[PDB]
Amino acid sequence: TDRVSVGNLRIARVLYDFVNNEALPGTDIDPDSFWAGVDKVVADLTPQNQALLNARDELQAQIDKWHRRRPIDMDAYRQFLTEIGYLLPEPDDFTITTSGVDAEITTTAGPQLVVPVLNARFALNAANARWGSLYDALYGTDVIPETDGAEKGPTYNKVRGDKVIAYARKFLDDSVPLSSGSFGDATGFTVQDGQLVVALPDKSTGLANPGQFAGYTGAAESPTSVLLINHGLHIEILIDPESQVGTTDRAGVKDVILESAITTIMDFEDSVAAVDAADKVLGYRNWLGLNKGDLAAAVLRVLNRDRNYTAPGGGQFTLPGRSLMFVRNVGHLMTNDAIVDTDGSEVFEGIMDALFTGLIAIHGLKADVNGPLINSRTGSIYIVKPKMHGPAEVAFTCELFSRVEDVLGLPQNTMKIGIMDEERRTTVNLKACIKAAADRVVFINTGFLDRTGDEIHTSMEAGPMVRKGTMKSQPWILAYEDHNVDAGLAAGFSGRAQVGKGMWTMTELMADMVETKIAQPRAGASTAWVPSPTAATLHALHYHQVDVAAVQQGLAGKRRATIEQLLTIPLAKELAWAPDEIREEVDNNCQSILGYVVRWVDQGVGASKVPDIHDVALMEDRATLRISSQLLANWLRHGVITSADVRASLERMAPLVDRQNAGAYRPMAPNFDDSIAFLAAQELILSGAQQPNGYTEPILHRRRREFKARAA
Ligand SMILES: Cc1ccc(C(=O)/C=C(\O)C(=O)O)cc1
Ligand SMILES: [Mg+2]
Ligand code: NI
């Protein structure tokens, strides 16, 4: 209610003051001009942000009418989408021209960690996760089974530590082979002639490929750590025979450190509840501390500094201590009262984010004002833009970034774009979307969770969908994943840009992650998303076993996905399911909505571990909420289930979600109809069909605001 008028804009004062007193000092931008430019960018690109948002509903309306009129003529289907401007012609082959891109993106294949920018500790850890102890990763997770006396105890279990050490020596054997013998046999390491030599219990061998020896610390004659490289990622053997772990170790190894989270996406979108100017500032403030380089916590944990090594021959070089940081703005749909206009119309959140995260990112290009730590050593600003539907929304984002770079005084194409392939209209037009961003594009990623949501909502009217667990094997999603890699490699992404795959959500099943997430490097993705620093280092194993660049060479030119397979709607069969299976699917989805929503609405937490009805802790975000809510809406709109069926499941799941929590937590049960979060969940399902492209934000935002408001 207390705002600052600049032009047609009414800036909430908390935002204005933050920009003026915290973000703008050090950017060379005079606050007068910046706001005047903000007002100017808002006023003129709001029309096209609104046109594009209008195109989405009218395309969807035409599709909904087509299915309801109508046993499905697929040639006619694809022709209709071509006729309404949903499917557009493929452009002809081209190479992306994006320049000034950090090497972690162009060349390096490895994990990419995603973290809510609103949690400064998490963001701190994510930035520091560029380096991760393989030992702590293995010890702390189920990768080493708690069996035969290897169970995690309140104190260090030396049986567990041995399987840890043994596992890591196996890894080193597969990544950096010795000419003869194994690292398990190693008794010590020295550097001679610029070449690493390892002491065995009989002879002394070297590296199979000595070029994998990348450096060391300490004296040549007994390093405190040897630095190894494999497939562009560094491995560090910490050597300390006096350390407790090193004392037991054949070679005095204290730890093996993996280069892990090569890049990190600091997220303003599906993993945060940022509903108003107060919420947005907390996130912008964290983004500012990360770009300054002085973000810190007590309970003093700092951002890591760079790591220095002696080069194998002479030299004293330096590797990045922290993960190269992206920011994920919100998409184009949502609106935020942080800025209202003269007439009360909220300003578009995506525009605001581009200017504010853009402005703040200026500090991360220098190192004393701007703070001491550099993010991009190439002057690029990395914004992944999510939920774009089609190439005209990409073009608008590039124009948007163009205008922001004007207001901000940056050269053009400073603001690079990570395109989320995660709406159906981007999938079937992906090559045109990359073209629309040919000079700003820096990755594509299959947002397979939002993409499933878009899939269900687009063909909502076609009939019941398969159960959610079944989507992973549907023709459309398998073509979607292969198509994304193809189009990226056809666009020149190899060595120029990242081809990225989606998020491992089972944060407690690391053994399974180590077993199955290798499929993503093996399919040619140069990065894949991990929810956690620990997961980053474990998923880093996979880039040591799979030569991602070599996989992408072999995939060149191959077109493994037809337009017809991309358009295969995941409809369920005839007799479908037993009431058995139906109820399981309803209970499962209702408990995943409720568990996620209650923390979103009552505590403004956008990313929660939520056990499903098989007691598997799932890291849940808005995208997973969108699937669950759209699938029940679809099952509802076709009579697979009843509105009272959905309420009964919500009623019976609420107490079990209540007992999955406690704290600061507010019990949903028994006063269901007067718990705001409960009604938010119910409305996400009962009104799921009505939301624009099934997005959950409109209902989540307004219910969060209303919860905040009843905290009067
Ligand atoms: C913990 C977490 C963080 C981010 C995401 C997410 O953004 C996925 C995608 O963008 C997409 O699969 O839709 C999921 C879980
Ligand atoms: Mg997504
Ligand atoms: Ni190899």
From Swiss-Prot:
<comment type="function">
    <text>Involved in the glycolate utilization. Catalyzes the condensation and subsequent hydrolysis of acetyl-coenzyme A (acetyl-CoA) and glyoxylate to form malate and CoA.</text>
</comment>
<keyword id="KW-0479">Metal-binding</keyword>
<dbReference type="Pfam" id="PF01274">
    <property type="entry name" value="MS_TIM-barrel"/>
</dbReference>
<keyword id="KW-0816">Tricarboxylic acid cycle</keyword>
<feature type="active site" description="Proton donor">
    <location>
        <position position="621"/>
    </location>
</feature>
<dbReference type="InterPro" id="IPR006253">
    <property type="entry name" value="Malate_synthG"/>
</dbReference>
<dbReference type="Pfam" id="PF20656">
    <property type="entry name" value="MS_N"/>
</dbReference>
<dbReference type="GO" id="GO:0005829">
    <property type="term" value="C:cytosol"/>
</dbReference>
<feature type="active site" description="Proton acceptor">
    <location>
        <position position="328"/>
    </location>
</feature>
<feature type="binding site">
    <location>
        <begin position="447"/>
        <end position="450"/>
    </location>
    <ligand>
        <name>glyoxylate</name>
    </ligand>
</feature>
<feature type="binding site">
    <location>
        <position position="328"/>
    </location>
    <ligand>
        <name>glyoxylate</name>
    </ligand>
</feature>
<dbReference type="InterPro" id="IPR048357">
    <property type="entry name" value="MSG_insertion"/>
</dbReference>
<feature type="binding site">
    <location>
        <position position="114"/>
    </location>
    <ligand>
        <name>acetyl-CoA</name>
    </ligand>
</feature>
<protein>
    <recommendedName>
        <fullName>Malate synthase G</fullName>
        <ecNumber>2.3.3.9</ecNumber>
    </recommendedName>
</protein>
<dbReference type="GO" id="GO:0009436">
    <property type="term" value="P:glyoxylate catabolic process"/>
</dbReference>
<keyword id="KW-0329">Glyoxylate bypass</keyword>
<dbReference type="Pfam" id="PF20658">
    <property type="entry name" value="MSG_insertion"/>
</dbReference>
<feature type="binding site">
    <location>
        <position position="531"/>
    </location>
    <ligand>
        <name>acetyl-CoA</name>
    </ligand>
</feature>
<dbReference type="InterPro" id="IPR044856">
    <property type="entry name" value="Malate_synth_C_sf"/>
</dbReference>
<feature type="binding site">
    <location>
        <position position="422"/>
    </location>
    <ligand>
        <name>Mg(2+)</name>
    </ligand>
</feature>
<dbReference type="GO" id="GO:0006099">
    <property type="term" value="P:tricarboxylic acid cycle"/>
</dbReference>
<feature type="binding site">
    <location>
        <position position="301"/>
    </location>
    <ligand>
        <name>acetyl-CoA</name>
    </ligand>
</feature>
<dbReference type="Pfam" id="PF20659">
    <property type="entry name" value="MS_C"/>
</dbReference>
<dbReference type="InterPro" id="IPR011076">
    <property type="entry name" value="Malate_synth_sf"/>
</dbReference>
<dbReference type="InterPro" id="IPR048355">
    <property type="entry name" value="MS_C"/>
</dbReference>
<feature type="binding site">
    <location>
        <position position="271"/>
    </location>
    <ligand>
        <name>acetyl-CoA</name>
    </ligand>
</feature>
<dbReference type="InterPro" id="IPR048356">
    <property type="entry name" value="MS_N"/>
</dbReference>
<keyword id="KW-0558">Oxidation</keyword>
<keyword id="KW-0963">Cytoplasm</keyword>
<feature type="binding site">
    <location>
        <position position="450"/>
    </location>
    <ligand>
        <name>Mg(2+)</name>
    </ligand>
</feature>
<comment type="subunit">
    <text>Monomer.</text>
</comment>
<comment type="pathway">
    <text>Carbohydrate metabolism; glyoxylate cycle; (S)-malate from isocitrate: step 2/2.</text>
</comment>
<feature type="binding site">
    <location>
        <position position="422"/>
    </location>
    <ligand>
        <name>glyoxylate</name>
    </ligand>
</feature>
<dbReference type="GO" id="GO:0006097">
    <property type="term" value="P:glyoxylate cycle"/>
</dbReference>
<comment type="similarity">
    <text>Belongs to the malate synthase family. GlcB subfamily.</text>
</comment>
<feature type="binding site">
    <location>
        <begin position="121"/>
        <end position="122"/>
    </location>
    <ligand>
        <name>acetyl-CoA</name>
    </ligand>
</feature>
<dbReference type="InterPro" id="IPR046363">
    <property type="entry name" value="MS_N_TIM-barrel_dom"/>
</dbReference>
<dbReference type="InterPro" id="IPR001465">
    <property type="entry name" value="Malate_synthase_TIM"/>
</dbReference>
<keyword id="KW-0808">Transferase</keyword>
<keyword id="KW-0460">Magnesium</keyword>
<dbReference type="GO" id="GO:0004474">
    <property type="term" value="F:malate synthase activity"/>
</dbReference>
<feature type="modified residue" description="Cysteine sulfenic acid (-SOH)">
    <location>
        <position position="607"/>
    </location>
</feature>
